[PDB]
Structures are given as structure tokens and as C-alpha cells.
Design a protein around this ligand. Structure first.
Ligand SMILES: CCCCCCCC/C=C\CCCCCCCC(=O)OC[C@H](COP(=O)(O)OCCN)OC(=O)CCCCCCC/C=C\CCCCCCCC
Ligand SMILES: CCCCCCCC/C=C\CCCCCCCC(=O)OC[C@H](COP(=O)(O)OCCN)OC(=O)CCCCCCC/C=C\CCCCCCCC
Ligand SMILES: CCCCCCCC/C=C\CCCCCCCC(=O)OC[C@H](COP(=O)(O)OCCN)OC(=O)CCCCCCC/C=C\CCCCCCCC
Ligand SMILES: CCCCCCCC/C=C\CCCCCCCC(=O)OC[C@H](COP(=O)(O)OCCN)OC(=O)CCCCCCC/C=C\CCCCCCCC
Ligand SMILES: CCCCCCCC/C=C\CCCCCCCC(=O)OC[C@H](COP(=O)(O)OCCN)OC(=O)CCCCCCC/C=C\CCCCCCCC
Ligand SMILES: CCCCCCCC/C=C\CCCCCCCC(=O)OC[C@H](COP(=O)(O)OCCN)OC(=O)CCCCCCC/C=C\CCCCCCCC
Ligand SMILES: CCCCCCCC/C=C\CCCCCCCC(=O)OC[C@H](COP(=O)(O)OCCN)OC(=O)CCCCCCC/C=C\CCCCCCCC
Ligand SMILES: CCCCCCCC/C=C\CCCCCCCC(=O)OC[C@H](COP(=O)(O)OCCN)OC(=O)CCCCCCC/C=C\CCCCCCCC
Ligand SMILES: CCCCCCCC/C=C\CCCCCCCC(=O)OC[C@H](COP(=O)(O)OCCN)OC(=O)CCCCCCC/C=C\CCCCCCCC
Ligand SMILES: [Cl-]
Ligand SMILES: [Cl-]
Ligand SMILES: [Cl-]
Ligand SMILES: [Cl-]
Ligand SMILES: [Cl-]
Lengths: 312, 312, 312, 312, 312
């Protein structure tokens, strides 16, 4: 049809709101995730105003191809949403109630610095492009911004779903455009990692540390190298989760520290054997008895320092 | 067209029913699964009533674009169903028989606490949204709620397919909506796990337990550590099935207990060697002869307790 | 348009036939497989009869939207076929020749009891639903049921493609429906398994069996346990083929028997060492010399019995 | 519209030609590969002939829905091509120039007998189906059969792209049909296999062969069995490339020969130890010194014979 | 409609420009990557010129089906772009402003010679095909060629986005066509490789090099062979990144050099043992003390030479 006449030469205000129904398929590698929710638009148009007393009907329904509908689009989506118009009602005063259901794929960056214990914010952007005849600005209606109680996501705890009412009215392509932001804060469940990744790793490391209570060179070599192979296999198991990041994560630092500890243990075993062969048993005994105590204290101190750096 | 006139000002009742034809692709990671079935709608409209004596035809078929059809949609689907209209017949009294075939992807939560022996319920939700002019409520017709005898699913035993007749008439978006629930209970087949996952694991553990019948330190170390590596490889084999859950499963608990047992066995071997070197052979012999009997009794007791906790 | 008038009040007969062009993508996990073939329909309609002498044309072509076409659908398909109408010709007497090309995905159960040497039958179901005005029954025309000589499938030998002429005229949804069955028998090529899976497994088992010709405990332990690890790795290699079945397959039974043999070998080695340490060398020598002969005879007998049970 | 009148009662000739733009995604497992190219059709129709002197225009463009276009389809494609009409021009004499762009997925068999050094021919089939009124035959225009210089395929060297001008005018479904064949010969690049698969395998085999220069039984057992495990792991690495074939390939034969060599080496080590224990050292020394020379000569001879059989 | 009349018989000039919004899914194996951006077309047509003084409107919007739009297509795309027309405005003088949003998949070759430290250029080609009536040439408008500040790509640092203004006006299919080139230079982030791939590899190699400080043959054999197995496992870990290339990469050369070093170390250990057994201990001691120093110097020199060759 056409934009409404400027009765007061004012920018047009539309009220929005998204009622989440379900979210799923949070792909961490591609940083994409899908939604399925509602969309309520409530603008005002005086050209559609009628008299309810004469007509005798409280609200009379028009056709989507019979009226004008402002274009509402998402920024960070691979393809356009699948719009399923559900209801349209026109109030006698002029306000038009609109509703629709859609599903789309959304792109949002993710931070994996504190991989086991991290909280992510998922952003959904709503943008309307002003036409030359009339200016249209966005708004947020708090009575429709919510989520369904059946919204479930595997491995995450949904905490809140709020929208920032302040729009960023920038200018792109010589046109003024508004933008709304919807934030969905989530938190990862870290229960299934303590008995799956952390504790077996510590058990293997402690098993490898038993070589300081022995004097047989072959047994020590077997212990240390076979535990190193087991460490590599467990890293193979763990590697199916971590994406590629340009910074240093917690898990990568821990794994590198474990590799360093294995190298130092091999060096110590070789030094002990070499001193024992060269007819200096007392020095080797002192070195191994001091290594026994020095290894785990240093391991605990390094873990404490890494935790104090990454988490504060 | 339009909703029928309120002849008695009563809510409109439609009778439903789904005849399953085939189900497949039960993805446990994403908790999605596809269907392909029928859909029977039988409502009443007096505006389409005709005289069969004058016309001479028992039932005369209309066109889907010539009548009104109430909108029936699913809640937990990624995309809209692929409707394939099959037949429409109008009875002289006013009842309209409708039929269609569809396929869709359904989301439903799954519980993996008792992973090898679990029963899941798959929910399909049917919702109709009332218009302002007329109120429409749902109903269940037991004569059409069934499944085809050729319905097959890999690894599961379909037990029943029933629909709860009671609808949850809540109010969403200032509109009254009804909801129907269809439940499909299934059970997992656990035959192919006893000789594939459980028994080889026990065999490897028993092989590792033979180190208590020997006194050679190198042989014991080789046995225990190589069996640990084999355990890690078998866990690699098993890991291609279990999803990520926020609670403790049966398999995870068993694997953690196995890791603990390996650690304790290594500790015992080291203690025996250290006592033997320090010129105390009798104490080492007593310790190993008591460990021989203590290990499997404790293993069986822990398994019994875990079974008694997870399954009752 | 409308069904033809009942000139004799007889059920309508249509002649079918599928000319396979290519089949591919036989997914064993999901038990789906795709086709691409023709479809010939030859029914009779007296309303389209014309005079060829007056018109002067042997056959005159109509439009698919100008005539009536009975609906032909598949039962076990995920989505509807992609119909590509190719030709339509109307004979003067009344017979109508119809032709089209399509591609679809078909679901059919598979039996994996004799996994290396198995023959499968792939079923394609054709169903027509009778209207209330006229009854339509199916038929098979043997002159069009065939396959193209270029039909190739990876790993399978296509043997035949026949259709059962007898239809199952059951009653579903208070309507009489007919059904046709097309069977495509195939056989798996088992050449690439003898030198890939079977023989290396036997070689590793025979290598592990050499521990009965030695008296060094450490060497025996190394041999047996390292061969067990190699067995687990080879099972990792093989596992990328077998689906999940509710019954006992041939390969699973063989693998379980191999695990049992490894366990018994470990037990025998431990017993020999324990008897040797306890100052009873003659008994240990007798036990090992009897085990040398007892192991392979028992292995061959068990293999023979499993083959006699699974294959007859 | 309709086929042109038989001015001379001659079969209609259309000139074809495909100008390749890009090819990609050569899936060896499914034997499918995608294209994107042009398609030039140049037939003759006297009904569209006009006078250029009177009109004053050299060529006047019609509409695709305003003229008749013969149907051109591919045989070995999963789905129909995505036709994008680009240009249509009608010459005054009657010849019609047609052009379009398309992309499709093509199925073609592949031969993997000489897997590292093989040349494959990719076939694209063009078929036109004659109507009852007029007969249409195909032809090849050499001025348009070519490939773009930017055509790139990962791992293959495109050599030629030619079309066989001779059509196979067979009869299918009681209709005469013509067929054209386009062949694209390619060759695999085998540089990245010599330092990736072949040489490390030889290095591991040579490492395992060092056991003939030693007399320690435990060291020999460790060497041979650990090298066997490394061989299995490297086969795991290599297995991600070879499809399933019903015949014997080069790589499979080489791997089987390697397994046989490992088995024979284990047998030789066991025999040497048994003879050494039984107080016959000279015989064991002679056997090992003869094995030292016999192993690599036999390996080289077997490799030469396999190469002479598979490649000539 | 039709091309504009040749007011001066000049080639038609259109001004282009792409404003990137987001890029993602850079598949290195298939060398494909997706985009989502804008597209501004600004051509001149005198037939749409109007009088703004008489009409009283600054710019009046037409319909996409009411005007002519030159066809703009991409060369290296699998499928056609999803055009979403956003705005069209006609200036009184005759210039027409056009805008649209699209998403597409683009193919571009990649160079993996310097895999960890490489810079790639991604090409997007724009082509317009001249009609016989009028000639259309392309142009670049620098005021619209840019990227959004939120453009993010995983693992890469976007540096610039420029378009070469010079078009390649070649002749294809007897028609003159222009082409524009858009280049997006990126660089890989190599932080997450130093502590993930390089350093553990060096640690394992250094661990294996400790065998020159020992005289026990069994311990040396265990060390070297087990470290070789760990090397193969780590290569398994690394192999999930490198595609297949017809030339020699940096990583492949390094891995081959590591394999060569392992082989030489095994040879040295065997030689030392053989000389020790044959009653020549001084020569073996000299050989091992010289190998101790010769191995790492040679390793460093080879690494320096490879770096000097691949990177200059
Ligand atoms: C070893 C004991 C580890 C205790 C860890 C406590 C962590 C804090 C905590 O319980 O947080 C609540 C959190 C809630 O779960 P979500 O991550 O939201 O799912 O609970 C957990 O993470 C519980 C973790 C307990 C681990 C159980 C390990 C038992 C085995 C111990 C054997 C002896 C060593
Ligand atoms: C350079 C890159 C890496 C090169 C390969 C490194 C392999 C591992 C090195 C092993 C070192 C072992 C040293 C050893 O056994 O000797 C101990 C030696 C003997 O002393 P004396 O009895 O007085 O002997 C002299 C009179 N006869 O004393 C020591 O402990 C020396 C200090 C050794 C520890 C430091 C080792 C550092 C290794 C390099 C790390 C690079 C990162
Ligand atoms: C070891 C014996 C294990 C017996 C387990 C019985 C479990 C109960 C049972 O049979 O349930 C019925 C159930 C039905 O199958 P679905 O899971 O529905 O497929 O049958 C089974 O699970 C049968 C399991 C039998 C395992 C056969 C193991 C034979 C090897 C034993 C060798 C000696 C140790
Ligand atoms: C702390 C984190 C883990 C640190 C690394 C742990 C590695 C494994 C520890 C191995 C302990 C071995 C103990 C050993 O060999 O000594 C046995 C020792 C010798 O006694 P005497 O003959 O009187 O000696 C004193 C007079 N000369 O006696 C014992 O058995 C002591 C008890 C040892 C068992 C308990 C070990 C607990 C290990 C920590 C578990 C953490 C979870
Ligand atoms: C070891 C010898 C094994 C002989 C097996 C014969 C099986 C029967 C047979 O040939 O069937 C025909 C069948 C046809 O192939 P499709 O499976 O249809 O493809 O041929 C085969 O399977 C041939 C199998 C021969 C295996 C060759 C093994 C050679 C290595 C032997 C080395 C010494 C041990
Ligand atoms: C129960 C669950 C499994 C528990 C852990 C099992 C680990 C493996 C068991 C190893 C048994 C080794 C037996 C051994 O070494 O002793 C041999 C012993 C010594 O006899 P004498 O010289 O008279 O000794 C008594 C006078 N001094 O004689 C034997 O051979 C006994 C029979 C042993 C074979 C049977 C073993 C069965 C093992 C359980 C299988 C469960 C399934
Ligand atoms: C070891 C030397 C192997 C030489 C192999 C020559 C093969 C023939 C040849 O060069 O063909 C040309 C061909 C062209 O490449 P495309 O396969 O088309 O890519 O080039 C190759 O394949 C070159 C192969 C050379 C391998 C380099 C190995 C260097 C390491 C040797 C270390 C000492 C052992
Ligand atoms: C049958 C299926 C496989 C069964 C399991 C096979 C395991 C491997 C077999 C190992 C054989 C080792 C033979 C051995 O050590 O004895 C050598 C023995 C001793 O001779 P004398 O000193 O005169 O002894 C007699 C007077 N005291 O002499 C030999 O070398 C015999 C020949 C052995 C080589 C042939 C082995 C063939 C093995 C079967 C291969 C099946 C394929
Ligand atoms: C070992 C020290 C290695 C120092 C490597 C410096 C490389 C140059 C550099 O910093 O480049 C900047 C670059 C920017 O990151 P992007 O690749 O763009 O992401 O930073 C890096 O790559 C930093 C690399 C530092 C590695 C840290 C290793 C710490 C462990 C050392 C333990 C002792 C051995
Ligand atoms: Cl959108
Ligand atoms: Cl729906
Ligand atoms: Cl269908
Ligand atoms: Cl096609
Ligand atoms: Cl395009």
C-alpha cells in the first residue's frame, strides 16, 4: 500500500517482542545455533481506523496482502526466516496487532577461554530500514519478551532472556536504520567433566609418578613411557570437543604442563641411572628422595597459579 | 471462507487421530526423530449441509480451497510439516471428513540415566489457536489412533501409542489455545551389549588382576600398565554412543570405578616391591595374599550397591 | 476432471511397471537407499475416445492438467517422489499411455545375521486409494518391469527385479486400497574380506599362540598382552561397518570367542609360571605340551560348530 | 507450441556442446561429482523465420515460453539440473541459437585397481526422446565443446574433454531415443604418497628386520610385536582413503604381504630361540644368518612380481 | 522492458560495490566458503526520467517487475545467489539506485605450502553479459566497497577488501563479457600451534634421544620403539587438518625428517649392541659419544635449511 501520512511528522514506532519456544543445535565449531519462537508487531495506522459501533464488530481481521507491513529482518542469519503468519487484528482506534512464527539459524561469537566453566551471551539483532517517505523506529514491549518453560538445551542452563530497549540508530548506505538487541545468557554444566576428564588424567599422572620409589631402570622406563602413551590416547579422547581459538585456554595450558612434567620425569630417571652406573649411589638416592617431594608440590603450585590467573 | 455461525454459541469440537506408518532416524545426540503418518480431522459445519435425496449422491467432494479448514500445527518441530491432502468428503448432515499425510522432525527430551536399560516416551503435541469470532477445542477419536504393523525402529521395541484426551487449555498471547499429547513408549534392546561391551571389559580386568600371583616386578608392571592402555582403547570404542548429560549415568560410574581399581592395583604392586626390597618379605606376602581375596569381593559389593542405587 | 462412468460397474484396472535406471547410496545404518527409474501407467477411459479416421492423426497428445490421472504413491519413502512427466498419448479406442521419471528414497529392513555372506530383498510398495465414486485396482504389466544394464551398486550383485502380481486389497480408514510389491534381490561381494579382516586376525592369533613354546615369563606376558592390544586395535578398524542388531551375528560371535581364547591363554601362562615357581616343573611341562595341541583343535571345532549353526 | 512441419520428412538435427566452467567434490566412496557449465542448442525452425530487411533488426529475441524448446536431459544425475536461461536469438533464415547455464551431480563408475596411479574417465550422457509427430536426433558441434582454463580439481590433472559424435539410437519404451557421450579423462597426482605412505612403511619394516642381528629373546619379541602394532596404527591412518572394491587392489596386496612377512619373522624368532634352548647353537646361527639375506631378496622379488602383474 | 536507446551510441556503465556483513564456514578440504553481503547497482536510464517540480516528490519508487534490471551473476558459485531486493529509487535526472542482499557459496583455490603461516586471497568474480542491442560494461564505486566491523572468521585475521577496477573484457560464446574481481586477503593465526603440535613433538623426540646415555639394550629398544609409537599417534592427532596437495608442504617435510631420524637412531642402537657383543667396547663407546653430539646439530641444521628454503 504505502506508509501512513505524517499526522504529526513524527517517526513511526513499532513495538516488538520474541517469545522463545525452543532452542537447539548449538554448534560450537561453527558458532551457529537455531531458534523457533514468535514475533509480535504492534504499530499504529490511522488509515485502517473504523467505527466499531456502526460495524458492530469488536475487531475485524484483514489480509496480509491487503495492508502494509513494515519489513523486519535479522542481521546475523545465514538465510531468511520462515515466516508463518498466524493472526492479524485491527483495533478500532488504529493500532494493529500482528503475530507470526518463525525459525532461523543465528551466528554469534563464543569465548572458550574458561572452557569447562564459561558463560556465553547469545545475541539476536532486529533491524528495520527507514524509507524515504517515513521514518520508522523500533521499540521493546516487555509484556511479550519471554521464554517458554519447556525450552531445553543440552548441556546448558538458560538463565535469562532480555532485550535492550535502547536502539543504535546509525546510518548505513545513506539511510537511517535502527537496531534492537536480544541477549540470552547461558551457563555450561560442568558435572560430567570431573569424573570423565579430570580425575582419570590425575590418576594416570600419579601412576607415572611411582617411578621414584624404584631402582630398576627397565621398569621405570616402561612405566613412564607407557603412561605417556596413555596420556596421548586420552588427549585423543578429549580432542573431540575443543575448537580452535587464537588465545590460550585453560585445558591447553594444563595439557602442556602435563607434557612438561613427563619430560622432566624422563630427564630425572635418566640422570639417576647415569649417576648409579658411574659409582655414585648416594647422590642418586638424594636426588630421587628430593624429587619425590618436589614434584607434587610444584604441580599443585602451578595449578593454583594458573587458576588464579585464568579465573581472576 | 469464515468460521461457522454460533448456532448454540458453543465451542467448536474437532476429532483428531494419527495413524503411524513409519518412524526412523532417532538421533540421540540432538534428541530428534522423524515420523510419517496420517491425520484425520472430523469437524461439523452446517453451512455445507445439503440434501442427499435431491442431489442423489451419498457424499459430494469439495475442494481444499473451497472450504474452511482449521489450522492444526505441531509445537516441537524444526520446520512445518509437508501436508499432502488425500481425501475430503462432506456428509449430508454437516460433518466433514478430512484426511492428509505428512512427515516431520520432532524434538523430545531423552533420559540416559540407565543407558543400557532405559525406556523413553516420545511426545507429539497438537495445538489449535482459537480465533476471536469462534472458539475451537480439540478432541481425540480412539478409532483412528493406532500404528501400522510394519513400523520398525532400529534397536527399540515399540510398545504403545496412545493420546491423552484431556487438553491443556491455557492462554498465550492473550488468546486461548488447546493442546493434545501423543505418547509413544519405547524400550531399548540390550542383547547386543552383554557380549560387546560388558564381558570383554571384565575379561581385561580379570587379566590385570593376575599380577597378585607373581613376584616379578617388571612382569607385574607390564601387565597392569598394558591392561590400562587396553582399557583406555576400549573406552575409545565405547565413547561413540554416550551423549553429554548433566547427571551421573551408570556407564560413567562403572568406568570411573574401573579407573579407581587400576590405581589401587598399581599402588599395591609398588608397596609390595618396596617392602620386598627393604628386607620384609613376610609382610609383603601377607599383603598380597590378602589383596588377592579383597579385590574381587569389594568389586562385586560396589557393583551390587551401584545397581541397587540406580535401579531402585 | 472426474472418474469415468461405470460402463459395466466394474473396478478400474491400471497397468504398472518400473524400469530401473540406477540405484545408489545403500545406507546400512539407516536402512535407506535411493532409486531413479521410470513409471508407466496404462488405464482406459471412454470419455477421451475419438475418431482417428476423421481427425487423421494416429494419437493426439493431451495435457496433464487437461485429463484426470489416478494418484499413485509409495508407502516407504521419506518424502514424495519428484515427478517429471515425459509423455502422454491417447489411443483412439480409449486406452491412455502415461510415462514419467522420478527419484526417491526408500526404507526397507535389512538382516545382518550372516554379515559377510548375506542376501537382501529390497521392497518398493505401490498403493492406490479408491475414491467413493469408482473403485480402482492395480495390475502388473510384465513388458515394462525390468532394469537398465548400466545399473550398478557398490559391493552388491543385483540378481533380479520382479513384481508380485497379487495385490493385498485391505481396508484402511474405511476405504479399500490396493498394494503392489516390487522385490530387488541382491547379494554382497565377500572377496575383499578374506585378505582384509579374516586372515590378519588369524595371523595375530597364531602369533599369540607361540607363547606355549617358551619358558620366559616376561616374554610370554609381553607376547600375549601386546597381541591382545593389537586385537583391540583391529576390532577398532572393523567396527566401522557393523550396525546394531537385536540378535547374535557371525562376526560378534567370532570376536567374543577370540576374547575368550585370549583370557584362557593368559590363565594358562599364569598357571605354568606358578607351578614352575612352586618346584613342580614336570607338571608344568605336561600342562604346556597338552595345551599346545588342545588350543587349535578346540578353536577349529568351535568355528565348525558356529558355521554349522549360523549357516544351516 | 508444436514440432515444426516435416518440410522434407527428415529427422530434426540439433547441435550441442558443453563449455565446462568448474568441477568439484569428486566423492570416491559414492562415485559422484558435481559440475557447472554451459549448454548451447542450435536447431532450425522455419515457422520463426522473418524478413530482416523489412524489420530492420539483425536478430530479434523471443521468450522461452513463446517458442518450443526440445527437451534435453541427463541420464546419470540424482536430480534434474538447475536451468538458468541466459540468451535466445533467432536468425532470419530460421536457425535458433539457445544458451543456458546449469549445475548438476553426476554418477560414474570408478576403477581403483591401481589406486595410487590410476586414470579415470568421467561420462556425461545427453538424451533426447523423439515425439510421435517428429523425430529428433542429436549432434556435436566442435566449436563449443571445451573447458575453461580456470577449471581446477583437487588431486587430479584434467587432460581432455571430448564428445563422441556417434549417437546410440536405441529403442526404449516403444520410442526411439538418441544419446550423446561426453568424456573427461583425469589422472591422479601421486607425489604426496611417496613421502606419506610408502616410505614410512618401509622404514618400519626395516626397523623390524633388525631382530636378525641380535640374540636376546625379549628384545627381539619387543621389536617385532611393537613394530606390528605400529603397522596396524599406520594402516588405521591409511584406511581413510580406500573404498570397497570387489577385486584385488595394489595397496591391499601390499598390506597382506606385509602381514605375511611379520608372521614369518615371528616364526623365525621362535625357531631360533627354541633351537638355542635345546643346545643346538650352530644350527640357530646358520638359520639366522641365512634369514638375514633371504628376507629382503624375497621381499624385493615379490614386489617386482606384483608390479609386473598389476601394471602389465 | 528493453535496453535504453543509444543516445550517444556508448557502452552502458553500471557502478557496483559489495558491503560485507559476515563470512563463515571456510572449508579447507573443498575450498569453499560462504558470504552474506549487500550489492549496490547504479546505472542510468533516460526513459525513466521525470520532472520533480511537477510531481513534487524528490524520488519516486518503482517496482522490480516494472523496470529493466541488468543481469549480474557470480562465476565461482555452486548455486545462484538468494536475491532479497531491499530498495529501489529513481532520481529525476535518470540515475537509478538499486540495492539488494544475498548469500552464496564461493569456490576459490587455496595454497597450503606454508601451512602454519600462510596468507590466502579469496576471489569473488562479477560478470555481466552484453546483449546484442546494447553493450554493458562494469565499474567499481569505491564509496560502497567495504566490510562490516562485525565480520569475524574463526582462525583468520581479515586484512583488506578491495576490488580491481580494471575489467577483463574477453569474448566467450561469440559475445563480449566484462568481469570484476574482489579480493579478500586473510592471514592464519598461528598461536594455537606452538603449544599444541610443535612443542610436544620436540619433547617426544628429545625423550627418544636419551637412549645414547645408556648401555642396556632392552631399555634402549623400549625407549625408541615406544617413542615411535607415540609419534605415530601424535601424527594421527595432527592428520585431521592437512588437505591433499600435489606439492611438498612444510609439515610433511618435518614429519618425514622425524621418521628418518627415528630410523637412524634404531640403526645406531643396533650397531652399538653388535659391537659390544663382538668384544669391541671402546669403538662402541666412541660411536655413542659422537652420536650424542652429532644428532641434535644435524637436526637443527636441517630445520634451518628447510626454513630457509620454504620461507625465502
Ligand atoms: C572429587 C570431588 C569433587 C567435588 C566437586 C564439586 C564441584 C562443585 C559442585 O558440586 O557444583 C555443582 C554441580 C552441579 O552440576 P552442573 O555442573 O550444573 O551439572 O555439581 C557438580 O559438578 C558435582 C561434581 C561432583 C563430582 C563427583 C565425583 C565423585 C568421585 C570421587 C571419588 C574420590 C576421588
Ligand atoms: C639440546 C636439545 C636436547 C638434546 C637431547 C637431550 C636429551 C636428554 C638429556 C639428558 C641429560 C642427562 C645427563 C646425565 O645423565 O648426566 C648427568 C651429569 C653427570 O655429572 P657427573 O657425574 O659430574 O658427570 C661428569 C663427570 N663424569 O650431571 C647432571 O645431572 C647434569 C645436568 C643434567 C640436567 C639438565 C639436562 C638438560 C637437558 C636439556 C633440556 C633442553 C630443553
Ligand atoms: C553371561 C550370561 C548373560 C545372561 C543375560 C540374560 C539377560 C536377560 C535376557 O535374556 O533378557 C532377554 C534379552 C532379549 O533381547 P533384547 O535385549 O530385547 O534384544 O536377551 C538377552 O539380552 C540375551 C543376552 C544373553 C547373552 C549371551 C552371552 C553368551 C556368552 C557367555 C559366555 C560365558 C561367560
Ligand atoms: C599426593 C598426590 C599423589 C602423589 C604421588 C603418589 C604416587 C604413589 C604413592 C606410592 C606409595 C608407596 C609407598 C611405599 O612404597 O612405601 C610403603 C611403606 C613402607 O613402610 P615401612 O617399611 O615402615 O617404611 C618406613 C621405614 N623404612 O608403607 C606403606 O605401605 C605406607 C602406606 C602406603 C599406601 C597409601 C598410599 C597413598 C597414596 C596417595 C593417594 C592419594 C589419592
Ligand atoms: C586362502 C584361500 C581362500 C579361498 C576362498 C574361496 C572363496 C570362494 C570364492 O572364490 O568365491 C568367489 C568369490 C567371488 O568374488 P565376490 O565375493 O563375488 O567379489 O571369490 C573370492 O571371494 C575369492 C577369495 C580369494 C582370497 C584370496 C586370498 C589369497 C591369499 C592366500 C595366502 C595364503 C594364506
Ligand atoms: C572370580 C573372578 C576373577 C578373579 C580374578 C581371577 C584372576 C585369574 C586367576 C588365576 C588363577 C591361577 C591359579 C594358580 O596360579 O594356581 C594354580 C594352582 C596350584 O595348585 P597347587 O600346586 O596344588 O597349589 C596348592 C598348593 N600350594 O592349581 C591350579 O591350576 C588351580 C586351577 C586354576 C585354573 C582355574 C582358574 C579359574 C579362574 C576363574 C575364572 C572365572 C571365569
Ligand atoms: C625416493 C625417491 C623417489 C622418486 C620417485 C619419482 C617418481 C616419478 C616422478 O617424479 O613423477 C613426477 C611426479 C609429479 O608429481 P604428481 O604426482 O603429478 O603431483 O613427481 C613426484 O611424484 C615426485 C616424487 C619425489 C619424492 C621425494 C622423496 C624425497 C625423500 C627421499 C629421502 C631418501 C629416501
Ligand atoms: C596350525 C595353526 C597354527 C597353530 C599355532 C602355530 C604357532 C606357531 C608355531 C611355531 C613352531 C615352532 C617350532 C619350534 O620351535 O620347533 C622347531 C623344530 C625343532 O626341531 P628339533 O630340534 O629336531 O626338535 C625335535 C626334537 N626335539 O624344528 C623346526 O624348525 C620345525 C619346523 C618349524 C617351521 C614351520 C612352522 C609352521 C607353522 C604353521 C603355519 C600354518 C600356516
Ligand atoms: C617457546 C616460545 C615461542 C615464542 C614464539 C613467538 C612467535 C611470534 C609471536 O608471538 O607472534 C605473535 C602471535 C600472535 O598470535 P596469532 O598467531 O595472531 O594468534 O603470538 C604467538 O603466536 C605467541 C606464541 C607464544 C607461545 C607460548 C609458549 C609458552 C610455553 C613455553 C615453555 C618453555 C618451552
Ligand atoms: Cl531475515
Ligand atoms: Cl507444523
Ligand atoms: Cl510418493
Ligand atoms: Cl536432467
Ligand atoms: Cl549467481
Amino acid at each position: 500500500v504505502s506508509p501512513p501520512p505524517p499526522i504529526a511528522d513524527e517517526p513511526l514506532t513499532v513495538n516488538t517482542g520474541i517469545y522463545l519456544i525452543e532452542c537447539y543445535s548449538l554448534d560450537d565449531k561453527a558458532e551457529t545455533f537455531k531458534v523457533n519462537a514468535f514475533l509480535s508487531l504492534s504499530w499504529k495506522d490511522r488509515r485502517l481506523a473504523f467505527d466499531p459501533v456502526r460495524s458492530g464488530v469488536r475487531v475485524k481481521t484483514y489480509e496480509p496482502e491487503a495492508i502494509w507491513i513494515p519489513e523486519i529482518r535479522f542481521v546475523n542469519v545465514e538465510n531468511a526466516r520462515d515466516a508463518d503468519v498466524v493472526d492479524i487484528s485491527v483495533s478500532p482506534d488504529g493500532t494493529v496487532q500482528y503475530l507470526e512464527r518463525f525459525s532461523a539459524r543465528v551466528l554469534s561469537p563464543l569465548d572458550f577461554r574458561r572452557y569447562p566453566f564459561d558463560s556465553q551471551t547469545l545475541h539476536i539483532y532486529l533491524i528495520v530500514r527507514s524509507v524515504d517517505t517515513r521514518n520508522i523506529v523500533l521499540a521493546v514491549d516487555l509484556e511479550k519478551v519471554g521464554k517458554n518453560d519447556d525450552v531445553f538445551l543440552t548441556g546448558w542452563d538458560i538463565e535469562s532472556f532480555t532485550a535492550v530497549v535502547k536502539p543504535a540508530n546509525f546510518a548505513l548506505e545513506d539511510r537511517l536504520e535502527s537496531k534492537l538487541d536480544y541477549q540470552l545468557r547461558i551457563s555450561r554444566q560442568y558435572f560430567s567433566y570431573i569424573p570423565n576428564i579430570i580425575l582419570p588424567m590425575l590418576f594416570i599422572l600419579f601412576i607415572s609418578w611411582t617411578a621414584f620409589w624404584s631402582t630398576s631402570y627397565e621398569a621405570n622406563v616402561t612405566l613412564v613411557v607407557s603412561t605417556l602413551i596413555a596420556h596421548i590416547a586420552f588427549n585423543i579422547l578429549v580432542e573431540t570437543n575443543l575448537p580452535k581459538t587464537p588465545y590460550m585456554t585453560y585445558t591447553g595450558a594444563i595439557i602442556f604442563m602435563i607434557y612438561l612434567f613427563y619430560f622432566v620425569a624422563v630427564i630425572e630417571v635418566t640422570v639417576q641411572h647415569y649417576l648409579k652406573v658411574e659409582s655414585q649411589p648416594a647422590r642418586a638416592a638424594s636426588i630421587t628422595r628430593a624429587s619425590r617431594i618436589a614434584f607434587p608440590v610444584v604441580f599443585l603450585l602451578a595449578n593454583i597459579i594458573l587458576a588464579f590467573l585464568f579465573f581472576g
